[PDB]
Amino acid sequence: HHHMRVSFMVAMDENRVIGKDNNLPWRLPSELQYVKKTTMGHPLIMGRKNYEAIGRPLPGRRNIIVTRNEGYHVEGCEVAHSVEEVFELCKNEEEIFIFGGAQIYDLFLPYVDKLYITKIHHAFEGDTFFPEMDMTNWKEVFVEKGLTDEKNPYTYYYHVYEKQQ
């Protein structure tokens, strides 16, 4: 029914941790740059909590916030209240990025076509997790080692998986 590619954009640790106390458990500037490079010029779909932690519209992209609050408004941002409303708003887009957090990854899980997942080789303390996925009929189409240096102190890899459909 929907015609845009639904891509997930996520960074997770060895136990699928993505969050701690409503923030990111790590700091990787190089991984963020990969995120900016990959998502530039495409809509970002983000959970209300995710968006408010970010705190500002991200430039050069449609910012779409997902909330059950029908009175919710943010300057420079679009607001959706369901999967279908997101699909309506993005009906003419070629590709959209589900940008988190966990509730929003769970929401859009039945529809994901492409997975950009950074895997961080460390076990952090956390409270928020990326959902489990059955990767049957998916293929890894890209993999590369992230930059580990003084400013990026963990080992991590970029992975991209595409659904076979």
Ligand X SMILES: CCc1nc(N)nc(N)c1C#CCc1cc(OC)cc(-c2ccccc2)c1
What residues make contact with ligand NAP under the rule CB under 6 A?
Answer: 10-11, 18-19, 22-24, 47-50, 53, 66-69, 81-82, 100-104, 107, 128
Residue number, 4 or 115, with CB nearest to ligand X? 115
Kindly tell me the number of DSSP H helices and DSSP E strands found in the chain: 4, 10
Say if strands 114-120 and 5-13 run parallel, antiparallel, or are unpaired: parallel
- If one asks whether residue 32 binds ligand X (CB under 6 A), the answer comes out as yes
Among ligand NAP, ligand X, none, partner that 79 touches (CB below 5 to 8 angstroms by kind):
none
As a three-state string, the secondary structure of 125-151 is CCCEECCCCCCCCEEEEEEEECCCECC
Query: Which residue of this chain has its Cβ atom nearest to ligand X in the complex?
Result: 11
Distances (CA, A) of 157 to 18, 24, 123, 136, 165: 15, 17, 15, 21, 25
* Bind-site residues for NADPH: 11, 18, 22-23, 48-50, 67-69, 101-104, 128
* Bind-site residues: 11, 18, 22-23, 48-50, 67-69, 101-104, 111, 113, 128
